[PDB]
Paper text:
Human enteropeptidase (hEP), also known as enterokinase, is an essential enzyme in food digestion and is localized at the brush border of the duodenal and jejunal mucosa. Activated hEP can stimulate the conversion of trypsinogen to trypsin via cleavage of a specific trypsinogen activation peptide, namely Asp-Asp-Asp-Asp-Lys (DDDDK), which is highly conserved in vertebrates. However, the mechanism of hEP activation remains to be established. hEP contains a multi-domain heavy chain and a catalytic light chain, linked by a disulfide bond. The light chain is homologous to trypsin-like serine proteinases with a typical Asp-His-Ser (D-H-S) catalytic triad responsible for peptidase activity.
In order to capture the substrate-bound state of hEP, we incubated active hEPwt and hEPmut with the physiological substrate trypsinogen. The association of trypsinogen with active hEPmut was validated by a distinct migration pattern in native gel electrophoresis. Thus, we incubated the active hEPmut with trypsinogen and purified the resulting complex using size exclusion chromatography, and did so in the presence of the cross-linker glutaraldehyde to maintain the complex for cryo-EM analysis. 3D reconstruction of trypsinogen-bound hEPmut yielded a cryo-EM map at a resolution of 4.9 Å, with this relatively low resolution due to the particles having adopted a preferred orientation, resulting in a conformation of active hEPmut with fewer high-resolution features. The overall architecture of the substrate-bound hEPmut was observed to be similar to that of the inactive hEPwt, with extra density observed to be attached to CUB2; this extra density could be attributed to trypsinogen. A full-length model of trypsinogen including its uncleaved N-terminal peptide was constructed based on a prediction using AlphaFold245,46, and this model was docked as a rigid body into the extra density. This N-terminal tail was inserted into the catalytic pocket, and the cleavage site was located at the center of the active site. Nevertheless, please also note that the resolution of the resolved trypsinogen substrate, including its N-terminal tail, was not sufficient to assign individual amino acid residues.
Author numbering:
A (entry chain A): 336 to 784
B (entry chain B): 785 to 914, 926 to 965, 972 to 1019
C (entry chain C): 16 to 186, 198 to 247
Amino acid sequence: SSELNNYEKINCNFEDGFCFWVQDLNDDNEWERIQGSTFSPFTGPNFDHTFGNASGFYISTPTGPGGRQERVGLLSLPLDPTLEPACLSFWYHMYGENVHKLSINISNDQNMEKTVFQKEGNYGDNWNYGQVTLNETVKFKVAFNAFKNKILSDIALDDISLTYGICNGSLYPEPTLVPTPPPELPTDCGGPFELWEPNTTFSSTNFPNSYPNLAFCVWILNAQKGKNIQLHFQEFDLENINDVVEIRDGEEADSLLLAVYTGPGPVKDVFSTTNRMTVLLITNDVLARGGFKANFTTGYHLGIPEPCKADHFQCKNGECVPLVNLCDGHLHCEDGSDEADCVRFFNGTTNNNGLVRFRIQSIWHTACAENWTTQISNDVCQLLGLGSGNSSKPIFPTDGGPFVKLNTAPDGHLILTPSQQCLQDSLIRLQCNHKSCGKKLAAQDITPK
Amino acid sequence: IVGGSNAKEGAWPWVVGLYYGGRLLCGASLVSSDWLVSAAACVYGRNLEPSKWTAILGLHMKSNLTSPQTVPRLIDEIVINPHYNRRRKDNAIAMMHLEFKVNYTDYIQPICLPEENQVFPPGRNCSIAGNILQEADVPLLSNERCQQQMPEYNITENMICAGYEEGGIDGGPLMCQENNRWFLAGVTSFGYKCALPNRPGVYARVSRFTEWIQSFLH
Amino acid sequence: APFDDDDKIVGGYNCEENSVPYQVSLNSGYHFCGGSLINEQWVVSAGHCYKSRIQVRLGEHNIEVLEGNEQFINAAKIIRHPQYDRKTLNNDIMLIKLSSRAVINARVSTISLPTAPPATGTKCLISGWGNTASSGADYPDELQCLDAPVLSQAKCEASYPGKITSNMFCVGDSGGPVVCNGQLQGVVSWGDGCAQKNKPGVYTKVYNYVKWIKNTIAANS
């Protein structure tokens, strides 16, 4: 105890093992020793200060990626009463992105602590020489506390050289500790803006390399009045839903959406309608991809095929059917626009009510009810998207339009003939109820509990 | 629902689940035999590959998928609302088309769309739905109190709120019975913090998009 | 305004992917790495995730909420790769033998071994409980999945000069399974930062270790 020297008690190389020390016995973390390198790479240095070649033993954080924080404190014990201060020579290896602070406190037998030393940040890549004196005379329960923070917070230390007296002039200070946790503070949120005359070739923000994350750019493709916008792509390689491109066609406060493409592979082109195509970039912070190109080419009616005039009905997909599929019972146009609903109501209070307004091919008109039965009643109910025929009765002939004679036949389709030969025509006031909506159809019981 | 009771098998035939690559991703309301209606905030960015999506119709229990009441269907077309936004988050609805037609069986029935000029008054108790499909009663609230409780975001008329004032029990449709018939008063869109007080929950008002939904049912 | 869509109901987990039967969570008091279930008695993981005691949690979806379909099987023996270069993280792949055979069901099954090397642009499924933010520490308790096409070898070597080996190729996340077209082609090994510029993820090719895995299983079954 008394005969044991204080230097050998404090100063320790811990090459083969720890010297006579008190490291951790009560806290929830225990320091570990790293032989040059270990698992979880980028753990400070790859060697110690003495050996320095792939085989040096140095103390560091107990583990690598920690789930939560752990308080690690190197304890000590009082020493003999020394008049002169105590020179403490050491070299730390503080480095990392989530590094925390470490303090050196002094305790006594009167429940009094002091905290004056504290450092945090990345101090170079090698061992940074440091020195600090001690103004403790007799009673001093000093300690070296730290914290096991999240990933990228490993701190190393080696070759404690606490001596007595005052050492020589310390001329090896820390050159510059750069704050890594705020590496660059990305808050640009800018770049290219609303474009102009066709300078089609342009980078998005950093196109000739993988793009960085957290970037929120915007490209408002505009043109002259009456000109649409085209968005042909020569190369498209993005990430999943986390990285999408919400192509907008607002032109005002009420923004509209046209298409949202993502992922790798050449996606289809976009054909806007107005003269302002707003292109916003939405990227996540995980696994940023390469990017894509965009060469807009303005014009007139791009994408949408030119409709054929001179009695050529153009269905919503671009196909032309002059008179072969003008609501006659065929499915030429695959979008269903050729066989669209050429029937509706008239003077109807609710949705499933009104007149018997019918269009044979071009002009809308009424009908007649001389041979009206329940069969054609439910037929026109189903054709109008309704349920079964609840009731039907005429009121009075309103107009003298080209009404059609409805007929029935076992072939399924109804026979129609727009003959204008009918006195006191009875206009059908169709009263059809709704179909099987969201009502309880199963055999449910009554268990109010 | 956390504070919800188990619903009877067959009481909600218009409640199905959407599977994205074999995984239940979002809810949908079966409107027609070939077109469904779901929220756009959950199916966004996935409309490029409709073949990966698949809808299990008549699904009540995930472990009881071997029952013949569950009719699988494949998606081939996804239509997102044009007025959808990710920053403003307005009009988050999207329809999905089915590959083949399905028959209205005992456990597969279409839902009713809210007709125009029909506003649901506040304070109307009606439960919702969407392993075990539980349900819980959810009353209707006003837009003024809903905006005053959450002043961080502007809730316009295009959406309607419905939920408990004190919280605790909060893609699913907002089914509210009207004249012995259930309607589609909204879809379960989002929630700031579940099981927290003063969290009614804003739902997309379907009554403002009746003509938009009916235009694709044919 | 659906700005935070997390008020879902029965089913529909809170913003996380599911239906990944080969995804297992290695637990030693806290989630640290993932795994890959290839059979009923072996789990594939990263070599740097080696620990003394690891509880292989099978069928885990929420690491903090018990759903009733989890399988907790302790690790019987862990055999790392003999040529595992700890300095360069080469051969970053190890095998974890389960103490008991897992119950194969609809939620826990096996993954097929790779029979062909992954070509450039092949779509792959990656799962894990890793960080979702490039800055800070935001590790939620939810399982997220991410798809990514396989990048070319030239760009992969250019992004990491002198760091990409023949067994590596670019495409909590440590040890995550990278299954491409129903075949486990890659294993998450390391990466410079969290989604840094021109820094894609580094993955170990299991196609070069198929024979080693087969020989290790046959000699330890």
